[PDB]
RNA sequence: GGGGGGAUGUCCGGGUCGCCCUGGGCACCUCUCCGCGGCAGCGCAAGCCGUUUCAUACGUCGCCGCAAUCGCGAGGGGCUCCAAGCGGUCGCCGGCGAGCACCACCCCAGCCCCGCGCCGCCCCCA
């Protein structure tokens, strides 16, 4: 749920009362932007702008931006039940028990698959792929798709029919995401350890000791810094392989061969110089 | 009491297929101190204990028919060739010893070649093709050979023992592929598929914590079943990855054997818990079974 | 299972004693909520059930010194007493030294563990 900027130096965090943007390079908060409760999601607008998209627990669609405070006045209430889940693409689609877009069990979450679109819906044990273990969280990578599902236990099933068990966590997982170029599976957990799943040669290497806080991790727009949401009301932009927080938020021819052309048969009884010239030019 | 070798009669009607186990007393038991056993088909089974004798076993007589022996020392591995027959049997002294299975007789035929280092004890073999051999070593090396000429192809040397203590990677199990690559199940828990055209490694899958003692492939080259000095077996699927690992067993797993015929594609494992335990190949299909 | 009650099938006090009943004890079996939690619609309704996986990184190591503090204890004396000594922890705006490499290749030995055969000794018949 925290989200970067298109030019990487701005972090974006929603709280239970407002929306706060941050400087990834230098300092703490930049804009206190008003967002009342008289919260489901906040992503960026996809095609032309980078404004925002916030959905509250019932239908009030905030289309609001940073670089201003504009957008504190215009919700939308086209849907009738309390909103559960929310995803934007380019074109908005909202999970209410079913979808409304522009089924047996209870819904959990819903995520969107890029430009040649696909939809991934998430109940407890069901998961709905749409072309045109008990779940906790999941991420995805396209190019033709790969889905990494976490779980209420420490099993991280991977799908590309058969899953793969990536079980480490001695409680629920709270965060599973694909890393960058898809080499690593960066996962988190309840037990403060941010595990780097190797997913190549099947090793594991991690960042163990932290502020008892790991849930809701996000990956940089490049292969760089991961930002961590943190259950002690903290976010943490960690650059990669530092694992140190950048942001805390609370014609060469030897002459002797031509001499060897002219050593034998001294002047007379030498071959005729058409032939001797063919020897010389054939040496060159 | 413990298992040390499992082998199926065939691996592909009322055709008599049987299962041959070797029990660590010295016993042999067949379902519908010995150390190794194979079959031969074109069907009779051959076994070794720790001594240098490689012996046939007649089944309807249930007596050790046609013992064979030799000069060198303790046989630690042997195996039979495929078709476009002999036996190849590697020992402690670094010899690999060819035995002849000319039509009915088990002869001490020939010792082709031997490593220069006497401290290279061979552990297992597998046949990459008809006439060329893959052998693990007690050092980090696994090594290919040709039996047309006896020659010594490329040493496929593993690393050091990083995880602590020892230096040498003792390669406990080696198997092959229908693709043409070869899996080496080494010590220190790891497995690694080595390429087959160039004889170099291509993937080093670390799954187990302690040394993989045995592994076996599917007959279609699809599922790889490892089993280690932990209580742990693990499966592998496509270059590769693992899927899961369940402690089916109770001691270390010491011997695998796979079969893919008669609508019953099972793989049977045994170790030192004295309990042979059978698995399907369709590991997401249903449960398993065990027999004692 | 709270109370459920079928002379069910049980003995010990009680009646000369027939089936038996009368106080104490429990094994079997069907209900309202729960003793307790698990499944299906909207802050809350209506109906069901029972007494195998998995654990927490790198970043640099060695020796010595100071300051607070703490422990053991040869050796000697009746759980206590003294003491030669020796270590640990926290601070060192203590200092010194070196960083693959305590590794690769090979050879000679040695500790340990394992094999096989001689002796050294003790045996029993003789």
SS (H, E, C) chain B: CCEEEEEECCCCCCCCCCEEEEECCCEEEEECCEEEEEEECCCEEEEEECCCCEEEEECCCCECCCEECCCCCCEEEEEECCCCCEEEEEECCCEEEEEECCCCCCEEEEEEEECCCCCCCEEEEECCCCCEEEEEECCCEEEEEECCCCCEEEEEECCCCCCCCCCCCCCCEEEECCCCCEEEECCCCEEEEECCCCCCEEECCECCCCCEEEEEECCCCCCEEEEECCCCEEEEECCCEECCCCCCCCCCEEEEEEEEECCEEEEEEEECCCCCEEEECCCCCCCCEECC
Nearest to A74 by CA among A65, A87, A83: A65
What is the number of other CB atoms lying within 10 angstroms of the CB of residue A233?
13
Work out the minimum CA distance from A218 to partner chain B, whole angstroms.
26
Give, as one character, the DSSP assignment of residue A47.
S
CB A107 within 8 A of CB A97: yes
Rounded CA-CA distance A131/A139 in Å is: 18
CB B2 within 8 A of CB B10: no
Rounded CA-CA distance A88/A46 in Å is: 7
Rounded CA-CA distance A116/B93 in Å is: 63
Distance B71 CA to C11 C1' (A): 84
Rounded CA-CA distance A279/A256 in Å is: 14
Strand partners, A94: A86, A100
Residue A68 tokens read as: 């201003």
Question: Chain B within 8 Å of A48 (Cβ-Cβ)?
Answer: no
Q: How far is CA B42 from CA A82, B18, B82, B107, in A?
A: 72, 15, 9, 18
CB A108 within 8 A of CB A123: yes
Give, as one character, the DSSP assignment of residue A159.
E
Q: How many CA atoms lie within 13 A of A128 on its CB side?
A: 17
What is the number of other CB atoms lying within 10 angstroms of the CB of residue B179?
13
Query: Pairing relation of β-strands B173-176 and A214-219?
Result: unpaired
CB A155 within 8 A of CB A148: no
Backbone angles phi, psi at A214, to 5 degrees: -70, 120
Residue B151 tokens read as: 């020659």
Distance A211 CA to C68 C1' (A): 33
Residue B275 tokens read as: 């309990």
Rounded CA-CA distance A271/A265 in Å is: 8
Q: Verify whether the Cβ–Cβ distance A165 to B206 is below 8 Å.
A: no
Nearest to B189 by CA among B166, B205, B165, B167: B205
Angle in degrees, CA B270, B271, B274, rounded to 5 = 85
Query: Pairing relation of β-strands B241-242 and B253-261?
Result: unpaired
Residue B28 tokens read as: 């042999």
What is the number of other CB atoms lying within 10 angstroms of the CB of residue A51?
16
Burial class for A246, CB neighbours closer than 10 Å (0-12, 13-18, 19+): middle
CB A118 within 8 A of CB A144: no
Q: Verify whether the Cβ–Cβ distance A202 to B242 is below 8 Å.
A: yes
CB B21 within 8 A of CB B6: yes
Interface test with B, best of A202, A203, A204 (most B CBs within 10 A): A202
User: Which residues, at least 6 apart from A260, have a Cβ–Cβ distance to it below 8 Å?
Assistant: none
Rounded CA-CA distance A111/A137 in Å is: 11
Residues in chain B: 292
User: Which residues, at least 6 apart from A4, have a Cβ–Cβ distance to it below 8 Å?
Assistant: A10, A11, A12, A24, A218, A220, A221, A227
Rounded CA-CA distance B280/B287 in Å is: 8
Distance A217 CA to C80 C1' (A): 64
Distance B27 CA to C116 C1' (A): 26
Q: What is the resolution of this structure in A?
A: 3.2
Rounded CA-CA distance A180/A252 in Å is: 54
Rounded CA-CA distance A65/A78 in Å is: 21
Work out the minimum CA distance from B48 to partner chain A, whole angstroms.
36
Q: Verify whether the Cβ–Cβ distance B203 to A164 is below 8 Å.
A: no
Q: Verify whether the Cβ–Cβ distance A165 to B204 is below 8 Å.
A: no
Taking an 8 Å Cβ-Cβ cutoff, which residues of chain B contact chain A?
203-207, 237, 241-245, 284
PDB experimental method:
cryo-EM
Residues with CB under 7 A from strand C: A 97, 105, 153-155, 165, 167-170, 191-193, 205-209, 243; B 117, 160, 167, 245-247
Nearest to A9 by CA among A241, A196, A239: A239
Contacts of B242 in chain A (CB under 8 A): 164, 202
Residue in this structure with the two tokens 């690559």, named with its chain if needed = B181
- Burial string for A108-139 (b: 16+ CB within 10 Å, else e) reads bbbbbbeeeebbbbbbeeeeeeeeebebbbbb
Q: Verify whether the Cβ–Cβ distance B242 to A203 is below 8 Å.
A: no
Backbone angles phi, psi at A273, to 5 degrees: -75, -10
What is the number of other CB atoms lying within 10 angstroms of the CB of residue B1?
9
Question: Chain B within 8 Å of A205 (Cβ-Cβ)?
Answer: no
Name the residue facing B206 among A162, A163, A202 (closest C-beta): A202
Work out the minimum CA distance from A135 to partner chain B, whole angstroms.
18
Burial class for A30, CB neighbours closer than 10 Å (0-12, 13-18, 19+): middle
Rounded CA-CA distance B273/A106 in Å is: 45
- Helix, strand, or coil (residue A274): helix
Residue in this structure with the two tokens 């019932």, named with its chain if needed = A58
Query: Pairing relation of β-strands B34-40 and B27-31?
Result: unpaired
Does the CA dihedral B203-B205-B211-B215 come out positive or negative?
negative
- Burial string for A159-177 (b: 16+ CB within 10 Å, else e) reads beeebbbbebbeebbbbbb
Rg (CA), chain B: 18
Residue A236 tokens read as: 């943490």
Give, as one character, the DSSP assignment of residue A3.
B
């Amino acid at each position: 749920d925290p989200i970067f900027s298109q030019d990487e130096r701005h972090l974006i965090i929603t709280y239970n009362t407002s929306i706060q943007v941050y400087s990834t390079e230098d300092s703490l908060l930049v804009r206190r932007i008003a967002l009342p409760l008289t919260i489901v999601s906040s992503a960026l607008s996809k095609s032309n702008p980078d404004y925002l998209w916030v959905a509250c627990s019932d239908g009030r669609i905030w289309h609001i931006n940073w670089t201003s405070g504009e957008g504190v006045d215009t919700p939308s209430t086209i849907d009738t039940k309390k909103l559960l889940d929310m995803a934007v693409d380019a074109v908005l689609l909202t999970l209410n028990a079913q979808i409304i877009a522009y089924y047996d069990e209870s819904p959990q979450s819903l995520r969107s698959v890029a430009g040649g679109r696909a939809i991934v819906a998430a109940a407890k044990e069901a998961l709905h792929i749409g072309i045109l273990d008990i779940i906790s969280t999941f991420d995805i990578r396209p190019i033709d798709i790969d889905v990494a599902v976490g779980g209420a236990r420490g099993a991280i099933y991977v799908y590309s029919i058969q899953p793969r068990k990536y079980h480490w966590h001695r409680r629920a997982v709270h965060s599973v995401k694909w890393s960058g170029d898809g080499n690593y599976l960066i996962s988190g957990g309840y037990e403060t350890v941010l595990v780097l799943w190797q997913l190549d040669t099947g090793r594991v290497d991690f960042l163990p000791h932290l502020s008892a806080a790991i849930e809701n991790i996000v990956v940089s727009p490049k292969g760089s810094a991961y930002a961590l949401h943190l259950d002690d009301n903290s976010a943490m932009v960690l650059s990669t392989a530092e694992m140190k927080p950048s942001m805390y938020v609370s014609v060469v021819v030897a002459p002797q061969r031509l001499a060897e052309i002219f050593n034998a048969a001294p002047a007379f009884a030498m071959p005729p110089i058409e032939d001797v010239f063919y020897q010389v030019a054939s040496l060159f | 009491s413990a298992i040390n070798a499992v082998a199926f009669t065939h691996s592909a009607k009322n055709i008599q297929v049987r299962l041959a186990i070797g029990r660590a007393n010295g016993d042999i038991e067949i379902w519908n101190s010995v150390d190794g056993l194979v079959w031969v088909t074109d069907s009779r089974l051959f076994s070794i204990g720790y001594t240098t004798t490689i012996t046939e076993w007649d089944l309807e007589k249930a007596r050790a028919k046609k013992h064979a022996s030799g000069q060198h020392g303790e046989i630690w591995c042997f195996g039979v060739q495929p078709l476009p027959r002999k036996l190849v049997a590697g020992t402690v002294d670094g010899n690999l010893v060819l035995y002849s299975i000319e039509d009915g007789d088990l002869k001490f035929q020939k010792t082709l070649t031997r490593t220069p280092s006497k401290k290279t004890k061979f552990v297992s073999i597998a046949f990459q093709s008809h006439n060329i051999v893959i052998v693990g070593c007690s050092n980090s090396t696994i090594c290919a050979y040709d039996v047309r000429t006896g020659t010594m192809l490329r040493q496929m040397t593993l690393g050091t023992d990083l995880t602590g203590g020892s230096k040498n990677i003792i390669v406990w199990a080696v198997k092959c592929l229908p693709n043409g690559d070869i899996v080496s199940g080494d010590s220190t828990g790891q497995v690694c598929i080595w390429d087959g055209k160039t004889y170099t490694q291509a993937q080093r899958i670390q799954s187990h914590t302690q040394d993989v003692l045995c592994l076996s492939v599917s007959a279609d080259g699809s599922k790889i079943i490892s089993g280690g000095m932990d209580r742990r077996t693990a499966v592998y699927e496509p270059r590769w990855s693992k899927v899961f690992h369940r402690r089916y067993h109770q001691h270390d797993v010491k011997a695998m054997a796979s079969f893919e015929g008669k609508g019953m594609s099972v793989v049977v494992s045994g170790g030192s818990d004295a309990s042979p335990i059978v698995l399907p190949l369709r590991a997401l299909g249903k449960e398993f079974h065990r027999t004692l």
